[PDB]
RNA sequence: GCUUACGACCAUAUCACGUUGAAUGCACGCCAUCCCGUCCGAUCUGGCAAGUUAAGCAACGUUGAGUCCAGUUAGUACUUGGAUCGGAGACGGCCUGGGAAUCCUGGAUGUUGUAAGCU
RNA sequence: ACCAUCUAGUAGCUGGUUCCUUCCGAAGUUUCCCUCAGGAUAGCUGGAUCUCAGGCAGUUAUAUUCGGUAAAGCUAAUGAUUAGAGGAACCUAUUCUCAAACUUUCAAUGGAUAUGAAGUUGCAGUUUCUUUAGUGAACUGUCAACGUGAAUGCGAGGUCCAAGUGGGCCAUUUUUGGUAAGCAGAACUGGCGCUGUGGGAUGAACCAAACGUGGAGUUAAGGUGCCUAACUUCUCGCUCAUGAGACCCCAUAAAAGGUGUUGGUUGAUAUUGACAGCAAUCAACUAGCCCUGAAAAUGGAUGGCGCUUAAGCGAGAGACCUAUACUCC
RNA sequence: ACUGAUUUCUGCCCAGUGCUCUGAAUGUUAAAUCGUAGUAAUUCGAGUAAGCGCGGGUAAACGGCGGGAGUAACUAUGACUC
RNA sequence: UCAGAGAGGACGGAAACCUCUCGUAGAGCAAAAGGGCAAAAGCUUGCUUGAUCUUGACUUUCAGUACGAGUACAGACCGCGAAAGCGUGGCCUAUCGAUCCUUUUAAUCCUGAUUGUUUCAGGUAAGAGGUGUCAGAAAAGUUACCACAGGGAUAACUGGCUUGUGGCAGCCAAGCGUCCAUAGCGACGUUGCUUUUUGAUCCUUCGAUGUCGGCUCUUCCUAUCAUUGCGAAGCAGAAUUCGCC
RNA sequence: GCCUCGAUAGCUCAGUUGGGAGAGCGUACGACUGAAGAUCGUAAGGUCACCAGUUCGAUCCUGGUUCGGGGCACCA
RNA sequence: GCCUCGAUAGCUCAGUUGGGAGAGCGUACGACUGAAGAUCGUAAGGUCACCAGUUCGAUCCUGGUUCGGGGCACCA
RNA sequence: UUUUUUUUUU
């Protein structure tokens, strides 16, 4: 059986990227984190304090606490037939804002703005629903300067 | 008579038989495990807001 | 004695190179991999014949040496030691293992069975795939027949099926003979002993002037 | 000898951050100087940059953002001619005056100068801006850069100037001039004399007595401006009074038209044409040699 | 078109050699009484302005090395699912969908923020 | 020793454990145990129901991410490792072959999160936290307005009490030890165990398909010369074997050969008459079937009989037969 | 207790384990006793027998009873030597 | 700023010590391996005791128990620094311990129930003394004189799969064979077959399949020693060798 | 096959944490003796078995390799 | 039979990546002696058991033949 | 106190 140390099998997971070692740039510390925000977890090997467990690497969580240089995150973890919302205290260096929620918030803003504009201007309420890409419509293709090229299977050649 | 025999064979089926239960929605409402100083200020703020 | 090759024929295990973890490995039987007129200039031998494999198996160092000796002997006897260049394009790097068991009567008294059955090094074998080149020979255009017959005689020392072919490439270079001739005329290919080096355009013009291309 | 800086070396080489290659920013200290606690969110944390060049003293107030620092106020010792002083724009007195200028200027800008006048009587004693009313004094943390923190260094002179101007700069009197490191005693009189430039006047008198030629060589432009060793202190006091009287930034001028003084990058066609010309020239030289 | 202070991204910014550099500035620079630090005023520190763009630095140059982007490699290698598919087997193709990476070829050689100043 | 009693001594071990229908329906896995033939523990399962009447899903889409396996690379670091070349070693540019405990680069499958009313905009209050500062952070209000923001499917949630199980085995794919094994050990999924039914002559697992009790029709896999329900049905080839061959798992066959026959590839000569003898031919290859390689013990196995322009091998066509499956009654 | 008629013999070892023999032996030793402190329980200290430890004997008590090199005027071996 | 390299300097040499250039970390960081680190996490040096006091939350193993280890805060008192800041042991991943009992530290603490004082004893809180079989009994052999409950979950004999080993048969020809690879052989290599060896496994049998050999008596297989009919020789014949039915 | 143990002058044996390589005999020189032997006075001598590593430095400490030696190898 | 080990001058033993065949006894001669023995010096002693191969090059490395030496070889 | 040897023939 395997040993059960904290950093077993993280040889590449906790390593830095090629030609990306050294001093950690400061935007990491300038980023703003508020409780209720969604963050991706990606361990930074250069910082050994407040490191997330390997199980949480690459997962997204919701912030529930904001301390001086760390955040508490609620991350879903599957244990047998239940998903547990584990709470973990991770430092800022291992955290990154999640764009999935921000995209949705932008879409909500656009929807509200479009609805307000249409109602104010008396236009009919617009369609504010994402729809799956439908099958292509009917069209005409012209062969002018694009004559069809007759293709045939090629014979076998002995490429030594 | 070897009797270690570990395996994970029939475990996902057992897990999924009654479904995989996702966490509830009120779990984000609790203020448990939050900074004590923030909690103290929240108590003070809530204890003073005039109702009307 | 050595176990029959059929016991280690097919590729079953992951590569097991000799390293700091695999120690006490006996030496491989085959040592020489270039024979004949190996110092000939690139233009000396323009014709090339390959012996490709049609099996995904293990070629033993013993088999490789036996084939080398056979092909070298025939080629030397029928063309002279300076009429050909033979290169073995397969080196035995995989270590096969053996779990030695006593084979005398009463052996079961001391025999451990399968308990702790991890083996010990036995020999070196070359992992081969379909289409892999085993032997190569560069010779003059009037010796392709001798080269083909030498490889035909050598193929009988390897397990399984081998296919002898001739190559459109100039000798051991990677350029088909026509383009090789054209580029060498243009001066884009500088001799590098057995092979040649392509002279790309980019670089300082002070270096360019030494050979305007 | 094996070439160390070969293709593999360059292929595996990783460059340092630009401001580290330039040898201008100490990122270890920068991280601790500019990073705000995450439970304070976007509240700016203000830093007082002090940098002394060969001919000028620069004092700035800034706070960091994810796209670059924001400088909110700045005072340069080359602005002191507006307030008297024309020479000696790098000594202890000039540094202190620059700090005072920055403090008063920014306090006026944010409309706190009336509330916080600072220490208006130069005594050399350690001073900290005590809170008045409800608004606490403006706060900034000192940033000395790559300078050495020695006793009596001019970076702490600029810090002292700002503190007396009335900005809360967390500090202790250990590294001010006049602080004896052995007995841990602080000589406010010595610090005041240094702030007023008495050391420069003493050097002037000493050189005048020793050798006139050396004196002229050392203080050529001081004499040209008419600053001898018996009015320098008064000049510095007048400078302090003028700064405390007016501190607003100087008015900007009009954008003079600009022309190209450097060479413009060659176009792709020009580069190819030069390559062709060089090829022809080299071939001709080969044929003619 | 530039200089400086503080930066953000952290080589399209690095590296080698060379040309040019208006004005501000940066820099080199002179001195060592004082503060300060050294075996050594070399570094660090302090007081200055005779001199210099020589170097730093900036722009530019190079069929430059590196880095970055793209093309090709190639619908190739590999691969999800299917077959009472072929083959003694190793393996191979077909159906259904995903789909690379070297060599090689071409191009680019920092972008930009706040503050102050030159032009 | 024998006799009676304590004594129906204890047993994690062996054997047995007695009526019928109906409904639901497992496990051989985790952790701890002088624990490994046993327990406790979680999981899987049944029952009682209770609260409600849209938020969920072993599936997709959109958006955003995680990874270092296959492939790739070594003319990129580390470690091997062949050969020369240009300036014995050394330097320079190359070169052949490689790595479970090497890597710049890097898939497919895969993992995770989000996709609105528990929301969005303001207004108007609280704080002893935070800021130089209504500066922020958070909260509060019977505050005001807006009105459901991918596809498909579907009712959802809660509590309690408790059984059996805690020897597994098989298969496609991946995979470790082993020369291998109907061997030992793992990963995903599906099965057998617990399960019958049509087919594979026979068979726990293979192919089809899961089951109340009957009927009609149609089929799946498999088949249609006779055993045996269904054609000696229709078309084109190939094959002669002194026991040919004959249908997933599957019930063994190789290296190497043939001037048996049938197709193809390449290079030649030939009507200025090709080879043989005093009008096509020659040579080398290739791959279909057949032949040699091919030896075991009671008499024996395409299942049997037999079959030779087949009832064999390959490509096909009509129809036809047959399930506890599908439709209808 | 061992050996086992007669005949002829019964070699070396008391380190180990036993058995045994002396004891001056403050080396180690229980209970009881004696002394100190305390208001008392109690604490501290001194004694403190046999045994053990030290010394001797004993194998017809249990038992035990070695290695490596070189070397003689043919070789071989090794009386001999280390 | 390291490892290292280059070039110089009395004795000094390949290596002592000094100087200058280059030097992406190729060094060092207590130890195994792997990550991490360059105005540092390395080296030199100043001052220090945050290796301190207190409670909760969380991660890891996980049953989402406990120990151990760790993370982020909060309250106190401190250290370093001009300051921002950093510090609850070691740059990160291992380096460790329940109940009962003993012992220590703590309160100007509680109890000894006939009232009090002082000893003594017992409690509440935090440590130490240790269980290495490490969720933690106090523990030497032999049985061929042996016994019981069971086990084909498990060995010894047969059978089964496998065939390493044993045995047998092929392919190419480097050589042997006076010359001549193939009369007869055939190395270096390589392909197979058999279950009359011995192993491997543990499928069946432990409420029993009588476990070696010989004697006797049948039948079967050939991989043919003899005999029948033949082909080939390094076949001129007793003789001998190879092969075929 | 498993478990140990050792390897040091020409031979037989010590040796230190790790900073020395010793002892006897053997060999060489001088002396005593008519000469040899004994005796007296001197000298030189080892693969620290081989490697890699650990620390300032290893015969020694650790690991592996080569040689030798010892013990176990039992049911049926 | 199998695992092996070795074959070197008349006899006994060293030796090598593989790049020379050494030592002793024995034999012949010389010195020494009155002459010998002994002792010294020289000369010396070989197809490296044989064959084939691999190598630029084999006594050594691979295969075979001969000669021997040490071990292994039902069963219940 | 210790104190062993001295080739063959002449
Ligand atoms: C602390 C450790 C253990 C302790 C003691 O022996 C443990 C107890 C445990 C128990 O419950 N019952 C017992 O009889 C023994 C002791 O005195 C020493 C060995 C040291």
UniProtKB/TrEMBL annotation, chain B:
Region span, Disordered: 1-24
Gene Ontology cellular component annotations, sorted alphabetically: cytosolic large ribosomal subunit
Keywords: Ribonucleoprotein, Ribosomal protein
Native source organism of the sequence: Caenorhabditis elegans
GO biological process entries: cytoplasmic translation
Family statement: Belongs to the eukaryotic ribosomal protein eL29 family.
Gene field: rpl-29
Signal peptide bounds: none
Name of the protein in its database record: 60S ribosomal protein L29
Alphabetized GO MF terms: structural constituent of ribosome
Stretch of the intact protein here: 2 to 53 of 62
Keyword Membrane carried by entry: no
């Amino acid at each position: 059986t395997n040993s059960k140390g904290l950093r077993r099998g993280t040889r590449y997971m906790f390593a830095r990227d090629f030609r990306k070692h050294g001093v950690e740039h400061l935007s990491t510390y300038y980023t703003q984190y508020k409780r209720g925000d969604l963050v991706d977890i990606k361990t930074n090997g250069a910082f050994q304090k407040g490191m997330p467990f390997k199980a949480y690497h690459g997962r997204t969580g919701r912030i529930f606490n904001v301390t001086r240089g760390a955040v508490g995150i609620i991350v879903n973890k599957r244990v047998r037939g239940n998903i547990l919302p584990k709470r973990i205290n991770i430092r800022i260096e291992h955290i990154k804002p999640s764009k999935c929620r921000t995209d949705f918030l932008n879409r909500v803003k656009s929807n509200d703005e479009k609805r307000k504009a249409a109602k104010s201007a008396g236009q009919p309420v617009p369609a504010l629903k994402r729809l799956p890409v439908a099958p292509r419509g009917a069209h005409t293709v012209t062969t002018q300067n694009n004559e069809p090229e007759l293709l045939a299977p090629l014979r076998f050649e002995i490429v030594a | 008579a070897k009797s270690k025999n570990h395996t994970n064979h029939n475990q996902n089926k057992k897990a999924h038989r009654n479904g995989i239960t996702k966490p509830k929605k009120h779990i984000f409402l609790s203020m448990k495990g939050v900074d004590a100083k923030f909690i103290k200020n929240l108590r003070f703020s809530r204890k003073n807001n005039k109702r009307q | 004695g050595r176990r029959p090759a059929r016991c280690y024929r097919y590729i079953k295990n992951k590569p097991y190179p000799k390293s700091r973890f695999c120690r006490g490995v006996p030496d491989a039987k085959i040592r020489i991999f270039d024979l004949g007129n190996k110092r000939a200039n690139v233009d000396t031998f323009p014709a090339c014949v390959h012996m490709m494999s049609n099996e995904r198996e293990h070629l033993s160092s013993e088999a490789l040496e036996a084939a080398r000796i056979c092909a070298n002997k025939y080629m030397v006897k029928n063309c002279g030691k300076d009429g050909f260049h033979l290169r073995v394009r397969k080196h035995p790097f995989h270590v096969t293992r053996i779990n030695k068991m006593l084979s005398c009567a009463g052996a079961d008294r001391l025999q451990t069975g399968m308990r702790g059955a991890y083996g010990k090094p036995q020999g070196l074998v070359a992992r081969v795939d379909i289409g892999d080149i085993l032997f190569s020979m560069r010779i003059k255009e009037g010796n392709v027949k001798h080269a083909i017959e030498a490889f035909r005689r050598a193929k009988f020392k390897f397990p399984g099926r081998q296919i002898i072919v001739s190559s459109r490439k100039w000798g051991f270079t990677k350029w088909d003979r026509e383009d090789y001739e054209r580029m060498r005329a243009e001066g884009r290919l500088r001799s590098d002993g057995v092979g040649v080096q392509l002279q790309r355009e980019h670089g300082p013009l002070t270096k360019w002037i030494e050979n305007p291309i | 000898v094996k070439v160390i800086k070969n293709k593999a070396y360059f292929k595996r080489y990783q460059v340092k951050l630009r401001r580290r290659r330039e040898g201008k920013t100490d990122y270890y200290a920068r991280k601790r100087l500019t990073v705000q606690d995450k439970n304070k969110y976007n509240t700016p944390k203000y830093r007082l940059i002090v940098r002394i060049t060969n001919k000028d003293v620069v004092a700035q107030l800034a706070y960091s953002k994810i796209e670059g620092d924001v400088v909110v106020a700045s005072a340069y010792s080359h602005e002191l001619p507006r307030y008297g002083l024309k020479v000696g724009l790098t000594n202890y007195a000039a540094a202190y005056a620059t700090g005072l200028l920055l403090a008063r200027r920014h306090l006026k800008t944010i409309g706190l100068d009336s509330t916080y006048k600072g220490h208006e009587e130069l005594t050399g004693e350690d001073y900290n801006v005590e809170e008045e009313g409800d608004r606490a004094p403006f706060k900034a943390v000192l940033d000395i850069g790559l300078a050495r923190t020695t006793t009596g260094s001019k970076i702490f002179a600029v810090m002292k100037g700002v503190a007396d101007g009335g900005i809360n700069v967390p500090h202790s009197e250990s590294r001010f001039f006049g602080f004896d490191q052995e007995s841990k005693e602080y000589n406010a009189e010595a610090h005041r004399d240094r702030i007023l430039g008495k050391h420069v006047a003493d050097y002037m008198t000493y050189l005048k007595e020793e050798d006139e030629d050396r004196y002229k060589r050392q203080f050529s432009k001081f004499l040209a401006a008419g600053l001898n060793a018996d009015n320098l202190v008064a000049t510095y006091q007048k400078v302090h009074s003028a700064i405390r009287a007016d501190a607003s930034p100087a008015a900007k001028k009009a954008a003079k038209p600009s022309k190209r003084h450097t060479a413009k990058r060659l176009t792709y066609d020009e580069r190819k044409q030069r390559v062709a010309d060089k090829k022809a020239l080299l071939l001709q030289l080969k044929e003619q040699q």
